[PDB]
Amino acid sequence: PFITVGQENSTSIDLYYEDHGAGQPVVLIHGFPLSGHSWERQSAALLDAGYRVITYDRRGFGQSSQPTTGYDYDTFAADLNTVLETLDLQDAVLVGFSMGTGEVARYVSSYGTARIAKVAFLASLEPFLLKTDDNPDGAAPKEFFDGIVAAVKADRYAFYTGFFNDFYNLDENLGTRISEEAVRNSWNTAASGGFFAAAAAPTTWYTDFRADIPRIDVPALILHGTGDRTLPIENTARVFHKALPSAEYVEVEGAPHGLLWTHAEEVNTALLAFLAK
Amino acid sequence: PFITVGQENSTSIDLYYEDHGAGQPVVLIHGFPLSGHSWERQSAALLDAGYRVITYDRRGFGQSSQPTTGYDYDTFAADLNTVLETLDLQDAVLVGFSMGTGEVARYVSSYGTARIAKVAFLASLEPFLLKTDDNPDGAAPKEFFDGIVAAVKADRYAFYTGFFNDFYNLDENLGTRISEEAVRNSWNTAASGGFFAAAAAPTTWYTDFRADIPRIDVPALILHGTGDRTLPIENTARVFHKALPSAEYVEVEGAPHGLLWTHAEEVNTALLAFLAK
Structure with missing residues (x-):
């Protein structure tokens, strides 16, 4: 299913989404370079507990359009606004x-x-x-982030192999918390994303969100893995909790960046306990 | 890289240019007696902000050809038009x-x-x-400008020394805002420019642009250093602001004429804020 969020030359920019279940709506917003299907272990647990689950694919990823424009967080939040207003979620x-x-x-x-x-x-x-x-x-x-952009432009297909090794901590988790076949599915999803978005997306990761945080005025949960090699916990979650001290805060011991799959039970228990409040 | 702009006797007149980055094109046009490389601190900030930066060397300067014809602003503007049309900048x-x-x-x-x-x-x-x-x-x-022409023709190499003393306010900035080595680099760039252009350029400085100002119909920024010894702020920026009151106007306190280098942080902050609007 699709929601139109803008136009690129002669074409529309459409995002792929799904809308399942009945209950309070939970909108799940995926990471790079995957798609809304990467939440399948959470989606299953949320459906089993009686929630309505909405997932969508960011522009340039999964089954969404692949424009070469709009890779910035004001556009990404405007795309999310269009989804919420179109579905009229409350x-x-x-x-x-x-x-x-x-x-x-x-x-x-x-x-x-x-x-x-x-x-x-x-x-x-x-x-x-x-x-x-x-x-x-x-x-x-x-310069560190500039180097990742350069590696994607050089050969995004080979880039994804090295990326998923540190995203899932495959040296620790391959064969126990993640199979070779689930890594292959991740690679295929990455390769289906647009070439321009693959290289443009890492430029948005170092956006400054410090002025956005004081506007968060609803209950919040911050959860992170202590084995995250991509986004180190000391420079992200631990300082984010100091900036948003009313949030509930969970560290998942030894989890990598890709913890939605490797540590799905740890994430799902924490997430559902939070949603029950 | 070169763009051809005309012919002199048996030779073409070619301008050196560079084109880096991606995004909205920003064309940087240097001053006397330097080249496009004099914008390096601005170029680095604009590439980091996500713009496409185009620089070129004016005829007779830097790595461009050194004709003994065309030192007037109608030709200089025609050279710029050839650059814009050749690259199809929009x-x-x-x-x-x-x-x-x-x-x-x-x-x-x-x-x-x-x-x-x-x-x-x-x-x-x-x-x-x-x-x-x-x-x-x-x-x-x-008679003051006729004096500069005479001084350049008497010995342009020694002339550059005195000129850079006042261009950078070296009595105040040498050793703090500008190094001896950065001044040496400016002197070598000036000495690599054409001998004819060095003495013909000062005659163009007093061109009358009063009839051109009313045709500026896009957003404009006017920035000037208050310590400018080369182009006195009271005879340039302060009167220009009165003639184009819709422009954003920025005075950089204590900065000299060569403020692209000595006050790069202040210049870059003002320029990126203006470009973001």
């Missing part, structure tokens, strides 16, 4: 993973929380990943 | 520094703004530097 829960935590913060900051009951940030970008003079808590200087 | 921003502010005004006036989104004038010449009866705000009479 009392909704927004759940972001990795890049998806940027949509949650910028949407709440720019559009407010009239339709939102709770938010949850899993494997968060916040507050601001760049290590700069005014942000000594950042994870790395800009 | 929605472009024109940024001029010192002499470069003459190309921006004359180009917009003569050719119009079909290809141009915004313009920026740093350390401007405008509106008319010559002190005359109909222009009491001018900075000096013709």
Whole structure:
């Protein structure tokens, strides 16, 4: 199913979405370079507990259109606004993973929380990943992120292999918490995304969200793995909790960045306990 | 890389240019007696902000050909037009520094703004530097500029030393805002320029741009250092602002003429804020 969010030359920009179940609506917003299907272990658990699950594919990923324009968080939050207004959702829960935590913060900051009951940030970008003079808590200087963009442009197909090794901590988890076949599915999903979006998306990861955080005025959950090699917990979740001290905060011991699949039981228990409040 | 703009006797007149990055095109036009490389601190900030940066060396300067013809702003604006048409730039921003502010005004006036989104004038010449009866705000009479031409023809190499002393306010900035080595690099760039252009360029500085100013019909930024010894702020920017009151106007306190290097942070902050609007 599709929702039109804009136009590119002679074409429309359409996002693929699904809408399943009945109950309070929970909108799940995926990370790079996957799609809304990457939440399948959470979606199954939310359906089993009586929630309505809405997933959608960010522009440039999964089955959504592949424009070469709009790779920035104001556009991504405007796309999310169009989805919520089109479905006319009320009392909704927004759940972001990795890049998806940027949509949650910028949407709440720019559009407010009239339709939102709770938010949850899993494997968060916040507050601001760049290590700069005014942000000594950042994870790395800009040249580090510039190097990832350059690796994607060089050969995105080979880039994804190396990327998924550190996304899932395959040296620790292949054969126990993730199979070779589930990694192959992730690679196929990545390769189906648009070439321009693959290289443009990492430029948005170091967006500054520090002015968005004070606008979060609904109950929130911050959850992160302590073995996350992509977004180190010391520069993201631990400092984000200091900026949003009313949030419930969970560290999942030893989990990698790709913890929706490897540590689905740990994530699902924490997520459902939060949604029950 | 080169773009051909004309013919001199048996040779073509080619301008050196570079084209880096991706996004909205920003064309940077340098001052005397330097080259496109003098914008390196601005170029680095614009590439990091996600713009496409185009620089070129004016005829007779840098790595461009060194003809003994065409040192006048109608030709200089025609050279710029060839660059814009050759690359097919659209929605472009024109940024001029010192002499470069003459190309921006004359180009917009003569050719119009079909290809141009915004313009920026740093350390401007405008509106008319010559002190005359109909222009009491001018900075000096013709005999002063005739003196500069004579001094360059007497020994341009020694002339550059004195010129850079006052271009950078080295009595105050040497060793803190500019290194001896950065001044040495400017002197080598000046000495690599053509001997004819070095003495012909000063005659163009007092061109009258008063009839060009009313044709600027896109958003404009005017920026000038208050310590500019080369182009006195009271005879340039302060009178230019009165003639184009809709422009964003920025005075950088204590900065000299060569403020692209000595006050790069202040210049870059103002320029990126202007481009983001």
